[PDB]
PDB file of C-alpha atoms in Angstrom:
ATOM      1  CA  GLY R   1      -4.726   7.905  46.763  1.00 45.57           C
ATOM      2  CA  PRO R   2      -7.008   6.408  49.468  1.00 45.10           C
ATOM      3  CA  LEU R   3      -7.709   3.064  47.797  1.00 43.42           C
ATOM      4  CA  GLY R   4      -5.620   1.088  45.323  1.00 42.36           C
ATOM      5  CA  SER R   5      -7.127   2.423  42.103  1.00 42.42           C
ATOM      6  CA  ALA R   6      -4.878   5.206  40.812  1.00 41.68           C
ATOM      7  CA  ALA R   7      -1.421   6.536  41.685  1.00 42.88           C
ATOM      8  CA  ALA R   8      -0.565  10.237  41.916  1.00 46.66           C
ATOM      9  CA  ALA R   9       0.239  10.836  45.589  1.00 45.60           C
ATOM     10  CA  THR R  10      -1.469  14.201  46.086  1.00 43.70           C
ATOM     11  CA  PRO R  11      -3.313  15.418  49.234  1.00 44.17           C
ATOM     12  CA  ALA R  12      -5.085  17.941  47.006  1.00 44.47           C
ATOM     13  CA  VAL R  13      -8.273  15.967  46.350  1.00 44.06           C
ATOM     14  CA  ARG R  14     -10.164  19.227  45.831  1.00 41.34           C
ATOM     15  CA  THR R  15      -9.060  20.360  42.372  1.00 43.65           C
ATOM     16  CA  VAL R  16      -8.498  18.277  39.241  1.00 40.53           C
ATOM     17  CA  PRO R  17      -4.978  17.428  37.939  1.00 39.46           C
ATOM     18  CA  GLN R  18      -3.416  19.868  35.474  1.00 41.87           C
ATOM     19  CA  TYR R  19      -4.110  17.917  32.283  1.00 38.55           C
ATOM     20  CA  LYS R  20      -3.261  21.062  30.322  1.00 41.35           C
ATOM     21  CA  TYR R  21       0.542  21.109  30.201  1.00 42.14           C
ATOM     22  CA  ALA R  22       1.229  24.651  28.994  1.00 42.66           C
ATOM     23  CA  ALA R  23       4.768  24.631  27.600  1.00 44.22           C
ATOM     24  CA  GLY R  24       6.652  27.919  27.719  1.00 44.53           C
ATOM     25  CA  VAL R  25       8.340  27.419  24.352  1.00 47.12           C
ATOM     26  CA  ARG R  26       6.412  30.250  22.695  1.00 45.83           C
ATOM     27  CA  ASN R  27       7.268  33.951  22.914  1.00 46.50           C
ATOM     28  CA  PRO R  28       5.639  35.527  26.023  1.00 42.21           C
ATOM     29  CA  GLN R  29       4.431  38.841  24.597  1.00 43.88           C
ATOM     30  CA  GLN R  30       2.517  41.568  26.430  1.00 42.33           C
ATOM     31  CA  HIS R  31      -1.215  41.584  25.638  1.00 41.93           C
ATOM     32  CA  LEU R  32      -1.753  42.004  29.382  1.00 40.54           C
ATOM     33  CA  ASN R  33      -4.939  43.990  28.771  1.00 43.95           C
ATOM     34  CA  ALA R  34      -7.160  41.092  29.838  1.00 43.42           C
ATOM     35  CA  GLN R  35      -8.147  42.386  33.277  1.00 45.32           C
ATOM     36  CA  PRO R  36     -12.007  42.521  33.145  1.00 44.85           C
ATOM     37  CA  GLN R  37     -14.278  39.506  32.672  1.00 44.67           C
ATOM     38  CA  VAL R  38     -13.949  37.790  29.295  1.00 44.64           C
ATOM     39  CA  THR R  39     -17.263  36.970  27.618  1.00 43.42           C
ATOM     40  CA  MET R  40     -15.679  35.764  24.379  1.00 43.53           C
ATOM     41  CA  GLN R  41     -14.492  32.273  23.425  1.00 42.92           C
ATOM     42  CA  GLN R  42     -17.824  31.015  24.771  1.00 44.22           C
ATOM     43  CA  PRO R  43     -21.019  31.067  22.626  1.00 44.84           C
ATOM     44  CA  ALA R  44     -24.493  31.488  24.118  1.00 47.68           C
ATOM     45  CA  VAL R  45     -24.996  27.735  24.485  1.00 48.22           C
ATOM     46  CA  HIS R  46     -26.816  27.082  27.761  1.00 47.35           C
ATOM     47  CA  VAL R  47     -27.985  23.742  29.164  1.00 47.87           C
ATOM     48  CA  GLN R  48     -31.498  23.081  27.851  1.00 52.92           C
ATOM     49  CA  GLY R  49     -31.296  19.298  27.666  1.00 58.51           C
ATOM     50  CA  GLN R  50     -30.698  16.750  30.416  1.00 60.01           C
ATOM     51  CA  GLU R  51     -27.508  15.278  31.880  1.00 59.66           C
ATOM     52  CA  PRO R  52     -25.399  13.522  29.185  1.00 58.37           C
ATOM     53  CA  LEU R  53     -23.714  10.117  29.390  1.00 55.27           C
ATOM     54  CA  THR R  54     -20.212   9.734  30.844  1.00 57.09           C
ATOM     55  CA  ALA R  55     -18.193   8.315  33.741  1.00 58.12           C
ATOM     56  CA  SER R  56     -20.470   9.978  36.298  1.00 56.94           C
ATOM     57  CA  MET R  57     -23.486   8.302  34.703  1.00 58.76           C
ATOM     58  CA  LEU R  58     -21.640   4.985  34.755  1.00 58.56           C
ATOM     59  CA  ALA R  59     -20.917   5.339  38.469  1.00 62.48           C
ATOM     60  CA  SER R  60     -24.636   6.024  38.885  1.00 62.31           C
ATOM     61  CA  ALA R  61     -25.347   2.350  38.182  1.00 65.51           C
ATOM     62  CA  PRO R  62     -22.698   0.358  40.152  1.00 66.47           C
ATOM     63  CA  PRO R  63     -24.887  -2.788  40.609  1.00 65.02           C
ATOM     64  CA  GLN R  64     -26.751  -2.170  37.352  1.00 62.93           C
ATOM     65  CA  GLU R  65     -25.269  -0.830  34.112  1.00 60.41           C
ATOM     66  CA  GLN R  66     -21.828   0.124  35.429  1.00 62.43           C
ATOM     67  CA  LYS R  67     -20.346  -1.733  32.470  1.00 59.55           C
ATOM     68  CA  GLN R  68     -23.163  -1.198  29.962  1.00 55.68           C
ATOM     69  CA  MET R  69     -24.219   2.432  29.401  1.00 58.35           C
ATOM     70  CA  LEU R  70     -20.559   3.112  28.607  1.00 57.03           C
ATOM     71  CA  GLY R  71     -21.017   1.697  25.144  1.00 55.66           C
ATOM     72  CA  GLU R  72     -24.612   0.487  25.029  1.00 51.80           C
ATOM     73  CA  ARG R  73     -26.531   3.559  26.204  1.00 51.08           C
ATOM     74  CA  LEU R  74     -24.165   6.309  25.093  1.00 49.53           C
ATOM     75  CA  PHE R  75     -25.117   5.793  21.456  1.00 47.56           C
ATOM     76  CA  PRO R  76     -28.020   8.342  21.593  1.00 49.09           C
ATOM     77  CA  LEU R  77     -25.575  10.667  23.350  1.00 48.34           C
ATOM     78  CA  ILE R  78     -22.594  10.544  20.971  1.00 45.27           C
ATOM     79  CA  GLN R  79     -24.798  11.692  18.096  1.00 43.98           C
ATOM     80  CA  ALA R  80     -24.757  14.948  20.057  1.00 43.68           C
ATOM     81  CA  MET R  81     -20.973  15.210  20.351  1.00 44.47           C
ATOM     82  CA  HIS R  82     -20.484  14.214  16.731  1.00 42.00           C
ATOM     83  CA  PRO R  83     -22.723  14.807  13.658  1.00 42.61           C
ATOM     84  CA  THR R  84     -24.539  11.472  14.032  1.00 43.52           C
ATOM     85  CA  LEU R  85     -21.058  10.001  13.547  1.00 45.56           C
ATOM     86  CA  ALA R  86     -21.874   7.495  16.287  1.00 45.76           C
ATOM     87  CA  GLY R  87     -23.331   4.080  15.483  1.00 45.19           C
ATOM     88  CA  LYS R  88     -19.976   2.618  16.451  1.00 44.32           C
ATOM     89  CA  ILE R  89     -18.075   5.226  18.479  1.00 46.68           C
ATOM     90  CA  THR R  90     -19.256   4.462  22.023  1.00 49.47           C
ATOM     91  CA  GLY R  91     -20.047   0.927  20.916  1.00 47.97           C
ATOM     92  CA  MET R  92     -16.339   0.759  20.201  1.00 49.49           C
ATOM     93  CA  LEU R  93     -15.559   2.244  23.585  1.00 48.27           C
ATOM     94  CA  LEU R  94     -16.542  -1.163  24.927  1.00 46.95           C
ATOM     95  CA  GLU R  95     -13.820  -2.810  22.861  1.00 44.55           C
ATOM     96  CA  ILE R  96     -11.279  -0.057  22.083  1.00 44.45           C
ATOM     97  CA  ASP R  97      -7.660  -0.025  23.264  1.00 48.91           C
ATOM     98  CA  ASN R  98      -9.250  -0.989  26.599  1.00 49.81           C
ATOM     99  CA  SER R  99      -7.465   1.968  28.181  1.00 49.93           C
ATOM    100  CA  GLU R 100     -10.198   4.232  26.835  1.00 48.28           C
ATOM    101  CA  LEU R 101     -12.714   1.806  28.306  1.00 50.65           C
ATOM    102  CA  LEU R 102     -11.118   2.386  31.708  1.00 49.53           C
ATOM    103  CA  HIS R 103     -10.466   6.118  31.552  1.00 48.83           C
ATOM    104  CA  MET R 104     -13.968   6.810  30.235  1.00 51.80           C
ATOM    105  CA  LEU R 105     -15.439   5.164  33.342  1.00 48.97           C
ATOM    106  CA  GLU R 106     -13.030   7.019  35.598  1.00 50.17           C
ATOM    107  CA  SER R 107     -13.458  10.534  34.183  1.00 46.36           C
ATOM    108  CA  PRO R 108     -16.546  12.589  33.153  1.00 46.23           C
ATOM    109  CA  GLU R 109     -14.351  13.944  30.360  1.00 45.25           C
ATOM    110  CA  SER R 110     -12.449  10.827  29.364  1.00 43.87           C
ATOM    111  CA  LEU R 111     -15.537   9.135  28.036  1.00 43.93           C
ATOM    112  CA  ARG R 112     -15.919  12.168  25.790  1.00 42.67           C
ATOM    113  CA  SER R 113     -12.287  12.730  24.792  1.00 41.98           C
ATOM    114  CA  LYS R 114     -11.813   9.001  24.280  1.00 41.36           C
ATOM    115  CA  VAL R 115     -15.077   8.812  22.351  1.00 41.69           C
ATOM    116  CA  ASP R 116     -14.243  11.721  20.025  1.00 43.83           C
ATOM    117  CA  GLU R 117     -10.792  10.163  19.625  1.00 46.21           C
ATOM    118  CA  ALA R 118     -12.307   6.740  18.982  1.00 47.07           C
ATOM    119  CA  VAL R 119     -14.265   8.509  16.261  1.00 46.51           C
ATOM    120  CA  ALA R 120     -11.055   9.236  14.429  1.00 47.69           C
ATOM    121  CA  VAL R 121     -10.481   5.512  14.823  1.00 47.67           C
ATOM    122  CA  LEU R 122     -14.004   4.557  13.748  1.00 48.79           C
ATOM    123  CA  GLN R 123     -13.731   6.630  10.583  1.00 46.34           C
ATOM    124  CA  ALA R 124     -10.332   5.056   9.939  1.00 47.15           C
ATOM    125  CA  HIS R 125     -11.949   1.639  10.344  1.00 49.06           C
ATOM    126  CA  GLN R 126     -15.233   2.415   8.592  1.00 49.52           C
ATOM    127  CA  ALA R 127     -15.001   2.883   4.813  1.00 51.11           C
ATOM    128  CA  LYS R 128     -11.195   2.894   4.871  1.00 52.13           C
ATOM    129  CA  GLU R 129      -8.731   0.082   4.188  1.00 56.29           C
ATOM    130  CA  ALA R 130      -9.567  -1.297   7.623  1.00 58.06           C
ATOM    131  CA  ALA R 131     -12.581  -3.068   6.125  1.00 55.03           C
ATOM    132  CA  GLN R 132     -13.230  -6.313   7.999  1.00 56.86           C
ATOM    133  CA  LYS R 133     -14.095  -9.466   6.056  1.00 58.48           C
ATOM    134  CA  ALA R 134     -15.463 -11.294   9.098  1.00 58.65           C
ATOM    135  CA  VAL R 135     -19.232 -10.792   8.998  1.00 58.67           C
ATOM    136  CA  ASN R 136     -19.945 -13.538  11.533  1.00 62.64           C
ATOM    137  CA  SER R 137     -18.465 -11.496  14.376  1.00 60.21           C
ATOM    138  CA  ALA R 138     -21.262  -8.952  13.951  1.00 60.30           C
ATOM    139  CA  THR R 139     -24.701  -8.938  15.578  1.00 57.41           C
ATOM    140  CA  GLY R 140     -27.735 -10.831  14.318  1.00 58.93           C
ATOM    141  CA  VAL R 141     -31.101  -9.846  15.777  1.00 60.20           C
ATOM    142  CA  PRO R 142     -30.931  -6.373  17.429  1.00 63.73           C
ATOM    143  CA  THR R 143     -32.336  -6.510  20.962  1.00 61.60           C
ATOM    144  CA  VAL R 144     -34.445  -3.853  22.682  1.00 62.35           C
TER     145      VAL R 144
END
């Protein structure tokens, strides 16, 4: 790496790291009939809306909301990823394990994978046994 941010030691700064570790534990059958272009496994969902919120968006406001839109502007965006399951997801992303707060700002996919994952954590902390008694740690008058 050029600067002292990450650590991977790879001159291949063109492609993204292989985050998909395909283990060869399964039985490698034939099914080698996939030569032409595959149009399946991908619905007809084009991009009609605008650019969503993520790490890229965060880096778009270095001297502005570099540490804000990550969990204070993503709210209207999460509702898209999850059935209006937001309201706390991204807001949590500014207080989660902290590692998700870092990865989300460093990857245009982390903010999404860590958000969706934080959802599993939000639901487990919502109406579950993770009910908090402290009501003074909450917000008072919502700003705009």
